[PDB]
């Protein structure tokens, strides 16, 4: 169900944040989802995966952003957050395995 090209995914922040954690933002590695919280917003969308690269959070481009810049952008993105994600599990595994 997950396409190759970037996709838009809307999620609502809750008491466990957006329901995922991130790695990367250094060297050749962009911002990747490393963990999806069971029952959290990202999981309930059914539309975000470990190994997704986050390209944008709302309008904030994360393609050339450090980890802390990405974490701040995600923290400050509000209650309703539109993530542009692109699924890159092989690249994720190269950097993280």
Curated annotation (Swiss-Prot):
Compartmental location: Cell membrane; Postsynaptic density; Synapse; Cytoplasm
Post-translational modification: Palmitoylated. Palmitoylation is required for targeting to postsynaptic density, plasma membrane and synapses. Palmitoylation by ZDHHC2 occurs when the synaptic activity decreases and induces DLG4 synaptic clustering. Palmitoylation by ZDHHC15 regulates trafficking to the postsynaptic density and function in synaptogenesis. Palmitoylation may play a role in glutamate receptor GRIA1 synapse clustering. Depalmitoylated by ABHD17A and ABHD17B and to a lesser extent by ABHD17C, ABHD12, ABHD13, LYPLA1 and LYPLA2. Ubiquitinated by MDM2 in response to NMDA receptor activation, leading to proteasome-mediated degradation of DLG4 which is required for AMPA receptor endocytosis.
Annotated tissue distribution: Brain.
Domain PDZ: 8-88
Domain comment quoted from the record: The PDZ domain 3 mediates interaction with ADR1B.
Record-stated family: Belongs to the MAGUK family.
UniProt disease annotation: Intellectual developmental disorder, autosomal dominant 62: An autosomal dominant form of intellectual disability, a disorder characterized by significantly below average general intellectual functioning associated with impairments in adaptive behavior and manifested during the developmental period. MRD62 is characterized by mild to moderately impaired intellectual development.
Subunit record text: Interacts through its PDZ domains with ANO2 and NETO1. Interacts through its first two PDZ domains with GRIN2A, GRIN2B, GRIN2C, GRIN2D. Interacts with ASIC3. Interacts with SEMA4C. Interacts with CXADR. Interacts with KCND2. Interacts with SYNGAP1. Interacts with LRRC4 and LRRC4B. Interacts with ERBB4. Interacts with KCNA1, KCNA2, KCNA3 and KCNA4. Interacts through its first PDZ domain with GRIK2, KCNA4 and CRIPT. Interacts through its second PDZ domain with the PDZ domain of NOS1 or the C-terminus of CAPON.
Function description: Postsynaptic scaffolding protein that plays a critical role in synaptogenesis and synaptic plasticity by providing a platform for the postsynaptic clustering of crucial synaptic proteins. Interacts with the cytoplasmic tail of NMDA receptor subunits and shaker-type potassium channels. Required for synaptic plasticity associated with NMDA receptor signaling. Overexpression or depletion of DLG4 changes the ratio of excitatory to inhibitory synapses in hippocampal neurons. May reduce the amplitude of ASIC3 acid-evoked currents by retaining the channel intracellularly.
Protein known as: Disks large homolog 4
Full-length numbering of the shown residues: 306 to 402 of 724
């Amino acid at each position: 169900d997950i396409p190759r090209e970037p996709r838009r995914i809307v999620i609502h922040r809750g008491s466990t944040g957006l329901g995922f954690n991130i790695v990367g933002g250094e060297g050749g590695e962009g911002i990747f989802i490393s963990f999806i919280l069971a029952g959290g917003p990202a999981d309930l969308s059914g539309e975000l995966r470990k190994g997704d690269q986050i390209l944008s959070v709302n309008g904030v481009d994360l393609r050339n952003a450090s980890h802390e810049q990405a974490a701040i952008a995600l923290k400050n993105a509000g209650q309703t957050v539109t993530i542009i994600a692109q699924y890159k599990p092989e690249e994720y595994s190269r950097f993280e395995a």
